[PDB]
C-alpha cells in the first residue's frame, strides 16, 4: 500500500527522469544539427564546418555528466540540512526549471539556453542518483530491501525504453514537434510533486538529529502496518550510536590511508572500466551507430525501440539472475562477454557487404551487448562499493566513485564522435580493449564477495597489501 505507492512515486520521479534524459538526445539529432547551423549562420553570417558542429554536439550531449559531477559534489553538503524529501522536492524544482529552459530554446533561438538546460538536467540527475537509494532503502523494511534495490535500475531501464519510444517519426520525431521532446519532462515532475508530499518522511534522518520520536513511530507504524515496531527502533538507535561512536574519515585521509590504497584503486578501476565499457554512448549515438551499420535509414527508430525493450527485459531477468549467479564470476563474465560481442560487432561492421544478411547481425550483437551489460556488472558495483569498505556507506568512497563515474561519462560522451570520425570501421575496438583490460584486471584483483563477511575480505586485502 503506502510502501508500494511511495516507491513507485519516487522511482518515477527520479530514475524515470534519469533514464529519459539518458536516451532522449539521439532521436532529434539531425533537427538539432539544422537548428545549430541556422542559428550560427544568422548570428555570425558564416557556415559551420562539420568538425565544429560535431564538437558543439558532443559538448551538448556530454555536459550532462559534468552536471552530474557537480550535483554529486553538492549533495553531500545539501543533505546535512535539507534531508531526503526536501532534497527530492528541490530535485523536482531543478527538473522543471531545466525542462522549461530546454523546451523554450527554439522559440527564442538560443543554443546557450539549451546548453544551460542540459547542465541543469545533469545536476538534477546527479542529485537524483545520490538521493533516491538513501530514501528507498530507508523507508523499506529489511525484508524486502532487495526488491527496492533492483527497482532503482528497473526504472532507469524503463526510462531509457520510453526515451527510445518518444522519438519515433510518428509520435515525437517530426520537424515541427522536436521541441516538445524536452517538454515531456514536466509530467514526471508534476506527478511526483503531486504524490510524494502526501507521504510519511524518512524516519532515520529525523531520528538522527532533531530526535522526533512521535513522528518516527507514526512513520514506522504506517510503513510496517503494525503498532509494535520496538525492535526496529532499537536497532536504528543502536546503529546511530555505533555510527557516532566512530570518527568519519574524509576523502583526503582516505586517499592518504595506505590500508585502503588497494581498495580505492580497485573501486576507481571498476568504475572507470564500467563507464568506459560503453552503454551511455550506445544510448546517445544509437541512431548514428545503426545508420553506419548498413541498416536502411527508414527503420532505425524502430531498432532503437527494440533496443530499449530488450534492455528492460534484460533488467527484469537480471533481477533474478543476480540472486543465483554471484558477484565476481558474474562481473568477469559480463566484461568478457562484452569484449567478445564488441569483437563480433566490429567484424560484422567491417565486412557487412559480403552477404546481404550480415548488416542484420549488428542488431543481434547489440542485443547481446545489452543483455551482457544489464544481466551482469550493470548493477553489481552499487552493492560492491558497500561490500568493500568497513562502514559500507563511506562518504569518501561514495564521493570518489561518483567523481570517477561522472568524469568517465563526460570523457566518453565528448570523445565518442571523434573516435568514430577517426575509426569509422573499427571504433568499437577501443571499447573491446577497455572491456578486456578491465576484465583481466578485476579477475586478477577482485575476490569473491558474496557469502563473505567484511572480516574475511579485510584480512585477505591486508595480506594482499604486503604489509
Ligand atoms: O542500469 C543501468 N542502465 C543504463 O542504461 C546505464 N547507463 C549507465 O551509465 N549506467 C547504467 N545503469
Author numbering: 54 to 520
Please give sentences taken from the publication describing this entry.
Subsequent genome-wide association scans highlighted the crucial role of GLUT9 as a high-capacity urate uniporter. Here, we present cryo-electron microscopy structures of human GLUT9 in complex with urate or its inhibitor apigenin at overall resolutions of 3.5 Å and 3.3 Å, respectively.
Urate binds to the central cavity of GLUT9. Notably, W336, N333 and Y327 form hydrogen bonds (H-bonds) with urate, while L75, I209, and L332 establish hydrophobic interactions. Additionally, there are some van der Waals contacts from V213, E364, C210, A206 and N462. Specifically, during the simulation, N333 acts as both a proton donor (73% of the simulation time) and a proton acceptor (76% of the simulation time) for urate. Almost all the substitutions resulted in well-expressed proteins with significantly reduced ion currents in electrophysiology and decreased binding affinity in MST. In the MST results, N333A, E364A, Y327A, and W336A exhibited much lower binding affinity, with values ranging from 230.9 ± 17.1 µM to 472.4 ± 52.2 µM, 681.2 ± 126.5 µM, 1080.4 ± 250.7 µM and 1149.8 ± 141.3 µM, respectively. Conversely, examining the residues implicated in urate recognition in GLUT9 and comparing them to GLUT1 reveals a dearth of H-bonds between GLUT1 and urate. Notably, the direct hydrogen bonds are more extensive in the GLUT9-UA complex compared to the GLUT9-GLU (docking model of GLUT9 and glucose) complex.
